[PDB]
Design an enzyme around this catalytic site. Structure first.
Site, PDB file in Angstrom:
ATOM      1  N   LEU K  40       0.797  -1.370   0.044  1.00 27.20           N
ATOM      2  CA  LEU K  40       0.056  -0.106  -0.035  1.00 27.20           C
ATOM      3  C   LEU K  40       0.900   1.264   0.045  1.00 27.20           C
ATOM      4  O   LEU K  40       2.134   1.129  -0.362  1.00 27.20           O
ATOM      5  CB  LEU K  40      -0.864  -0.117   1.466  1.00 27.20           C
ATOM      6  CG  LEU K  40      -2.508  -0.662   0.957  1.00 27.20           C
ATOM      7  CD1 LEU K  40      -3.555   0.049   0.235  1.00 27.20           C
ATOM      8  CD2 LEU K  40      -2.384  -2.070   0.456  1.00 27.20           C
ATOM      9  N   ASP K  41       0.277   2.372   0.320  1.00 31.60           N
ATOM     10  CA  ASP K  41       0.934   3.541   0.594  1.00 31.60           C
ATOM     11  C   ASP K  41       0.977   4.198   1.862  1.00 31.60           C
ATOM     12  O   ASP K  41       0.089   4.066   2.551  1.00 31.60           O
ATOM     13  CB  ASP K  41       0.752   4.635  -0.472  1.00 31.60           C
ATOM     14  CG  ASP K  41      -0.953   4.885  -0.447  1.00 31.60           C
ATOM     15  OD1 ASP K  41      -1.402   5.723   0.037  1.00 31.60           O
ATOM     16  OD2 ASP K  41      -1.403   4.178  -1.418  1.00 31.60           O
ATOM     17  N   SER K  42       1.790   4.959   2.309  1.00 38.61           N
ATOM     18  CA  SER K  42       1.811   5.580   3.748  1.00 38.61           C
ATOM     19  C   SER K  42       0.424   6.411   3.762  1.00 38.61           C
ATOM     20  O   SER K  42      -0.028   6.332   4.887  1.00 38.61           O
ATOM     21  CB  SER K  42       2.918   6.664   4.071  1.00 38.61           C
ATOM     22  OG  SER K  42       2.717   7.700   3.495  1.00 38.61           O
ATOM     23  N   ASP K  44      -2.396   5.497   2.568  1.00 44.24           N
ATOM     24  CA  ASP K  44      -3.354   4.508   2.755  1.00 44.24           C
ATOM     25  C   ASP K  44      -2.885   4.010   3.967  1.00 44.24           C
ATOM     26  O   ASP K  44      -3.772   3.434   4.668  1.00 44.24           O
ATOM     27  CB  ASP K  44      -3.361   3.361   1.531  1.00 44.24           C
ATOM     28  CG  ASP K  44      -4.185   3.937   0.343  1.00 44.24           C
ATOM     29  OD1 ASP K  44      -4.537   4.853   0.298  1.00 44.24           O
ATOM     30  OD2 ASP K  44      -4.066   2.998  -0.663  1.00 44.24           O
TER      31      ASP K  44
END
Ligand SMILES: CCCCCCCCCCCCCCCCCC(=O)OC[C@H](COP(=O)([O-])OCC[N+](C)(C)C)OC(=O)CCCCCCCCCCCCCCCCC
Ligand SMILES: CCCCCCCCCCC[C@H](O)CC(=O)SCCNC(=O)CCNC(=O)[C@H](O)C(C)(C)COP(=O)(O)O
Lengths: 71, 459, 127, 172, 122, 128, 55, 81, 12, 55, 86
Positions: K40-42, K44
């Site tokens: 995922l992303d930070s 997210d």
């Protein structure tokens, strides 16, 4: 400590109700609506009006006792 | 009165010759016994004061104040055997010697039948007190405090002495009775005005006075706890008691030459109460609070109104009992935290439940809510001031504002809130502390049933 | 972006010590060990009545509790107030002064028996 | 100390959704505008000019302050919430138990015995943990307040007593 | 009411102020205006413990509501026509209140027009 | 855009949209880093004494005693008589006192001016 | 006013304690069929508070 | 009980009013990442919320039912009178 | 399960 | 966890419920007339007690 | 308010991570590192906490939010704040 209450919590679903708590709610909601227009039918002048309001233009000059304008 | 004066002296040989550890116990019980004897003076006839002899006489003003002194002596003795038991017996015995002597002068002063006789021991209370602050005090600034206290009251006492002997040389004896019956209307001449200042400034410098109140923060805060009660509970009433006793040969000069003093006291109490709202020391907040109430007493006397005196006596004794109790409150923390900063020891209700309660009704009694005689004291003065001038209530009631904010602010900051994390010395309240404090508030509430005794000579 | 190994192990050690600390925060079933207490020698009647707590028993059992509460907090207070009022408060004049009993035309006053004459004829106008 | 640029964006995004939740109230609209709010976030992510980012943060939070709910939603047990330390009254420090009367102490025998074990264990481990603290101080004083974990075996993490023995959030 | 609109937003000189009137004499324009009547002497109305604000002409219809209500106790729904009887005369004298208000208003208009008519005539 | 927030002493500017933190320079970088350093020294030493199982007293706080000393004692020895202090003392001092003197005397003179020829009604005022 | 206004409080108190002491109106909904008695009590107080006829 | 968690694979976005959000974001290009999280809030027994007026008219059915019996009783009693 | 409650000494 | 089945909650609210339904009807019909209820008065401010709350 | 063990915790936690459609509904390891495993992303990753914050109804400090990187750490942190010990 010890649980075992008459209710139990639920996860994102409708909690259980009981026969009493519904009709007790139903009863007082019912008799208040009973009380609403039962007093209306037995007493309407309180909300609607008890006597008509006479109109200003209608009452006659003579009964008002104003001296005639000509003299 | 000999039934009180001789027994009060008799404790001194007894305490000096009692056993090593029986000093506090023996002294306390007879000290309570003497106060029981002093309860006999509460009766006053509907007429002239009880004149026992030419040497001593008591009125409906002295007797309520006298019993406060006698009831007080157990309270310092029972408030001091914790911060002095680590000292030698002789110094501990000497401490009782000062306290007993301090009472004896107060008893004789309040009952003096002669004005000049009043003056000697009323001034002579300095010597036993000055020893207490300077010797057993617990801070460096106590020495400058002792000089501040001693010189500040002596600067006014001497002009009174010259004034009193002058009245002797012009009107004969200064017996309180013959003075009252032989009254001469004081002229508005310049000399009489200066005589008025001499006969008044000595007493008015003694309560507080706005401008002359600088010794209370020095003295009361730095004094030992046994002493610290006295500098606020009874000796402030000596400056009071003098006022109603001396303001009978000054009429009507007090009618006119009172605006500067009335104006200083009315606005002054708002200022010094505002000091309490922004103070840092627990004792200093209490001492400055005593300034505002005492300034209210100063206002009360200077109208010469039956209602004014009627609530004046009640306010003094009600304030004196409270200010002592609050000074007990400061002591209770002072033993545990060993510092007087307010925000150092917040959160005491969680740790000490009953001591929080003792701090509670003490604060309400200082709040002067009804029916506590603090209210019956202030409220009577309000009406007397209001009849004198309607604008007074604007200044009168505004004091009730500040006295409400800081009283709970002292309560809220200390008792309520989260407890101090780093402290681990607060132990359960000693039964001595709780019992002492009950002996303060309970008679104060018990007096509420019949404040007819405390009302004063005008009633 | 991130429990660093040092702080992650710190939180790891600090967690289990706290877990064991809470694991010692309970009390034994014997706890609290209560010292013996003296009972008023009248509870035996009610507790024996409370052994079963039957519907034929519980209502009557609660009746004594409701009865003694009624006597203690109503009967005794009302008696002392009435005694205070009847012979001490009302002994001094004008301490129980009440509003004058409102009366209307056509009513006989009790202590004189005089019927006040009826108010004169009404105009008799309705709706 | 140093709050990096990507951190503040994360905090601003978190506060934006909380404020957007307060405005939207209803869940479906909350998910609607948050996705739109998300949609207007990810497209400004591949910028090589940090001056653009800080400039972007300028009017972005200036928008956040203008559009913030005057009555934002906070859970009760958080700063500003309706239950912020409302249970702090009941909590009592553990050391106050040392003042209990022996009759009271004897009325909780086993727990107080376990308290003695905690006291003795802390007394023994205090010397070890303080020795570890002084043995690994960063030069020029402690650089950060973060505590070092227990390194060796059979020891306890330094400066652990208050955090481990802190009163529970549900004291009663 | 339209009176306020005709006064503040209209010709205020032709609107009778409630505090001012009655100004004109009672019989001015009224041949043999008949005085009001009071069946109940002030003795019984004083006796009936009736409020002074209630001590009006129509209070004579009020003094028996309390009597019957006291007799009807605890039944609080007994006196219905009798209570209706009092509030009717309340209405009647209330009805009298704005007719005389308008009577003085019509007199005010009549006098004002007459004065202007004769002013230009003379 | 839209109107911004203008600050005041009582309503301070939020320390989030303040431009100072948004622009950053290397000098500021160690400037805040040394804020953590000095704070860490204060916190660790306090916690060390706090967690000491033998410390049965009060951990003395130098900031508290300095604050009390500066606010109470170390003020007059540093007081210097200067114009602004001089007028401020005169204004907040004799100012209200003389001002209250005027109105209260104004009330008093008007009051006794009323009663000396009978321009007041106190027929029932007896418990003065 | 004493009757219904006091009533509106513990009915809200009923909601507050049951739904984990939360006072923000943003966090309830659907309690009509889930809390029948309190919903009836709340609307009765609301109607009474409005001077609605014959109440 | 051990508070049996309902199985995940029953709460979806269709039918619930959340679905109107879905294709609206589909036209935007972003897909709803947490629609099922609020699925229960709009589905299950918690759906079919009564309209605003129906809350006020709660019990009207039994109310008017009690009206006719009471009014009819009065009508005959007044007829007897 | 019920657990220990920490309260200040009251016996005094 | 929403629930109101506790008898203490139900009985406490119910007492105020049955109080609120009647209350004014009993009190107003029962207390003696103490003011003068105005009667002659036009319709459009008679209904406004309920008109204003309808909007 | 009935108490809650850590067993009910990850039942509620793992439920909510299963809620994320971006998360594969069957790759929920108890130490599923959000960056290395779920990819995922930070941003997210930030999106997770307020989902957890509403789930358990309480604030998670932002400074601790990014420090939580696995389902276990989320489970550990919620247990500590609510002083969960069984
Ligand atoms: C008949 C009698 C019945 C029993 C009465 C018992 C007492 C009572 O309640 O009296 C009510 C009476 C009420 O008077 P009354 O006018 O109602 O008459 C009473 C008789 N009945 C009830 C029948 C009408 O009031 C008093 O007696 C006043 C009591 C005041 C008590 C004050 C105690 C103060 C203690 C101080 C201790 C500390 C001293 C040192 C410090 C001093 C301050 C500096
Ligand atoms: C409702 C309230 C009112 C309404 C208002 C609610 C708030 C509106 C905020 C609007 C924000 C604005 O568009 C952009 C700005 O402020 S600044 C530039 C962001 N971009 C960069 O700085 C590039 C570098 N990139 C990174 O730092 C990482 O990529 C990142 C952290 C972004 C994601 O990391 P990934 O998740 O690992």
């Amino acid at each position: 400590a010890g649980g075992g209450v008459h209710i139990e919590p639920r996860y994102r679903q409708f909690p259980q109700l009981t026969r009493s708590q519904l009709i007790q709610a139903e009863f007082f909601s019912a008799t208040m609506w009973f009380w609403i227009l039962w007093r209306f039918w037995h007493d309407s002048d309180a909300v609607l009006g008890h006597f008509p309001y006479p109109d200003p233009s209608q009452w006659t000059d003579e009964e008002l006792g104003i001296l005639p304008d000509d003299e | 009165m000999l039934k009180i004066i001789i027994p009060t002296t008799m404790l001194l040989p007894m305490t000096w010759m009692s056993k090593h550890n029986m000093i506090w116990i023996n002294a306390t019980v007879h000290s309570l016994l003497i106060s029981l004897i002093s309860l006999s003076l509460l009766n006053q006839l509907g007429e002239n004061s009880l004149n026992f002899s030419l040497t001593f006489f008591s009125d409906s003003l002295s007797a309520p104040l006298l019993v406060l002194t006698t009831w007080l002596l157990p309270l310092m003795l029972m408030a001091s055997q914790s911060h002095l038991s680590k000292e030698t017996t002789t110094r501990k015995k000497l401490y009782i010697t000062m306290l007993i002597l301090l009472q004896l002068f107060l008893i004789m002063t309040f009952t003096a039948t002669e004005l000049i006789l009043f003056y000697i021991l009323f001034e002579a209370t300095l010597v036993p007190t000055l020893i207490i602050i300077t010797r057993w005090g617990n801070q460096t600034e106590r020495l400058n405090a002792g000089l501040y206290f001693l010189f500040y009251t002596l600067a006014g006492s001497l002009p009174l002495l010259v004034a009193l002997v002058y009245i002797q040389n012009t009107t004969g004896s200064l017996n309180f009775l013959i003075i009252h019956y032989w009254s001469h209307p004081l002229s508005n001449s310049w000399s009489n005005i200066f005589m008025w200042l001499a006969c008044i400034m000595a007493f008015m410098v003694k309560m507080p006075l706005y401008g002359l109140h600088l010794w209370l923060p020095k003295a009361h805060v730095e004094a030992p706890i046994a002493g610290s009660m006295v500098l606020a509970a009874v000796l402030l009433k000596l400056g009071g008691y003098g006022m109603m006793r001396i303001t009978t040969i000054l009429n009507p000069l007090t009618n006119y030459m009172a605006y500067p003093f009335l104006m200083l006291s009315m606005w002054g109490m708002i200022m010094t109460s505002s000091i309490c709202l922004r103070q840092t020391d627990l004792k200093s907040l209490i001492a400055y609070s005593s300034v505002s109430h005492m300034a209210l007493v100063i206002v009360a006397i200077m109208i010469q109104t039956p209602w004014s005196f009627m609530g004046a006596t009640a306010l003094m004794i009600a304030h004196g009992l409270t200010s002592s109790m609050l000074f007990c409150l400061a002591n209770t923390n002072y033993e545990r935290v060993h510092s007087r900063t307010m925000i150092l020891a917040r959160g005491l209700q969680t740790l000490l439940p009953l001591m929080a309660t003792w701090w509670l009704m003490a604060s309400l009694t200082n709040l002067a809510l009804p029916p506590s005689i603090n209210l019956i004291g202030e409220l009577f003065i309000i009406t007397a001031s209001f009849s004198w001038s309607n604008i007074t209530i604007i200044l009168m009631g505004m004091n009730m504002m500040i006295t409400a904010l800081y009283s709970l602010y002292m309560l809220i900051t200390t008792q309520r809130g989260k407890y101090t994390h780093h402290i681990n010395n607060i132990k359960a309240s000693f039964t001595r502390e709780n019992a002492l404090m009950a002996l303060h508030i309970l008679p104060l509430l018990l007096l509420t049933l019949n404040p007819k005794m405390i009302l004063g000579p005008l009633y | 972006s991130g429990y660093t190994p040092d702080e992650k192990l710190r939180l790891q050690q600090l967690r289990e010590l706290r877990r064991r600390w809470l694991k010692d925060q309970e009390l034994s079933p014997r706890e609290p060990v209560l010292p013996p207490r003296r009972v008023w020698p009248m509870e035996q009647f009610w507790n024996k009545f409370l052994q079963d707590g039957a519907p034929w028993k519980n209502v009557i059992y609660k009746t004594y509790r409701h009865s003694i509460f009624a006597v203690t907090h109503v009967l005794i207070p009302v008696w002392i107030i009435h005694y205070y009022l009847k012979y001490h408060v009302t002994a001094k004049p004008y301490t129980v002064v009440e509003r004058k009993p409102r009366i209307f035309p056509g009513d006989t006053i009790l202590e004189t028996g005089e019927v006040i004459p009826l108010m004169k004829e009404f105009p008799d106008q309705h709706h | 100390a140093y709050l990096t640029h990507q951190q503040k964006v994360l905090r601003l995004y978190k506060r934006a959704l909380r404020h957007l939740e307060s405005w939207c109230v209803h869940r479906d609209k909350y998910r609607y505008f948050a996705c739109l709010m998300r949609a207007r976030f990810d497209e400004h992510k591949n910028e090589k000019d940090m001056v653009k980012a800080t400039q972007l943060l300028r009017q972005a939070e200036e928008e956040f302050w203008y559009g913030q709910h005057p009555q934002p939603y906070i859970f009760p047990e958080s700063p500003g919430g309706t239950s912020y330390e409302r249970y702090e009254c009941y909590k009592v420090p553990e050391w106050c138990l040392d003042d209990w009367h022996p009759s009271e102490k004897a009325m909780y025998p086993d727990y107080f015995a376990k308290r003695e074990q905690w006291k003795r264990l802390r007394r023994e481990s205090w010397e070890r943990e303080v020795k570890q603290l002084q043995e690994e101080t960063p030069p020029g004083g402690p650089r950060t307040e973060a505590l070092p974990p227990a390194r060796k075996e059979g020891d306890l993490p330094p400066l652990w007593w208050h955090i481990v023995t802190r009163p529970r959030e549900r004291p009663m | 009411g339209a009176h306020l609109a005709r006064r503040y937003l209209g010709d205020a000189s032709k609107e009778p102020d409630p505090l001012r009137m009655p100004t004109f004499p009672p019989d001015y324009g009224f041949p043999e205006r008949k005085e009001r009547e009071m069946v109940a002497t002030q003795q019984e109305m004083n006796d009936a413990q009736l409020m002074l604000q209630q001590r009006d002409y129509c209070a004579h219809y009020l003094i028996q509501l309390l009597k019957c209500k006291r007799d009807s106790f605890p039944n609080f729904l007994a006196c219905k026509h009798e209570q209706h009887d009092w509030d009717y005369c309340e209405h009647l004298d209330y009805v009298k209140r704005m007719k005389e208000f308008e009577r003085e208003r019509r007199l005010l208009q009549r006098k004002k027009r007459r004065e202007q008519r004769e002013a230009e005539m003379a | 855009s839209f109107p911004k927030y203008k600050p005041s002493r009582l309503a301070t500017l939020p320390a989030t949209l303040d431009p100072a933190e948004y622009d950053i320079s290397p000098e500021t970088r160690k400037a805040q880093a040394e804020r953590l350093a000095i704070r860490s020294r204060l916190k660790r030493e306090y916690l060390l004494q706090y967690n000491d199982p033998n410390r049965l007293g009060v951990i003395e706080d130098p900031a508290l005693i300095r604050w009390t000393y500066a606010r109470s004692a170390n003020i007059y020895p540093n007081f210097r008589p200067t114009p602004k202090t001089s007028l401020l003392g005169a204004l907040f001092g004799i100012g209200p006192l003389f001002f209250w003197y005027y109105v209260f005397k104004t009330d008093r003179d008007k009051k006794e001016k009323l009663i000396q020829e009978g321009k007041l009604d106190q027929t029932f005022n007896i418990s003065y | 006013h004493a009757f219904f206004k006091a009533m509106l409080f513990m009915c809200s108190g009923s909601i507050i304690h049951s739904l984990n002491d939360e006072q923000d109106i943003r966090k309830m909904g659907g309690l009509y069929k889930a809390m029948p008695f309190t919903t009836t009590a709340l609307i009765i107080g609301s109607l009474a508070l409005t001077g609605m006829p014959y109440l | 009980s051990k508070m049996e968690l309902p199985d995940y694979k029953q709460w979806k976005i269709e039918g619930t009013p959340l679905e109107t959000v879905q294709e609206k974001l589909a036209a935007r290009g972003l897909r709803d990442p947490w629609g099922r999280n609020e699925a229960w809030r709009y589905s299950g027994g918690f759906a079919n919320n009564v309209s605003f007026v129906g809350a006020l008219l709660k019990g009207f059915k039994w109310g008017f039912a009690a009206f006719v019996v009471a009014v009819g009783a009065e009508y005959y009693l007044e007829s007897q009178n | 399960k019920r657990l220990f409650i920490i309260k200040p000494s009251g016996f005094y | 966890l929403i629930n109101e089945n506790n008898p203490l909650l139900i009985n406490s609210i119910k007492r105020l419920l049955i109080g609120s339904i009647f209350a004014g009807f009993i009190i107003s019909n029962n207390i003696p007339p103490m003011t003068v209820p105005n009667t002659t008065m036009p319709l459009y401010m008679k209904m406004t007690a309920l008109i204003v709350t309808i909007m | 308010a009935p108490p809650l063990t850590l067993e009910a915790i990850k039942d509620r936690v793992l439920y909510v991570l299963k809620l994320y459609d971006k998360i594969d509904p069957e790759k929920l390891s108890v130490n599923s590192h959000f960056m290395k495993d779920l990819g995922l992303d930070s941003l997210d990753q930030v999106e997770i906490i307020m989902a957890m914050e509403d789930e358990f109804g309480f604030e998670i400090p932002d400074i601790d939010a990014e420090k939580l990187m696995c389902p276990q750490e989320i489970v550990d942190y919620i247990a500590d704040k609510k002083d969960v010990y069984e």
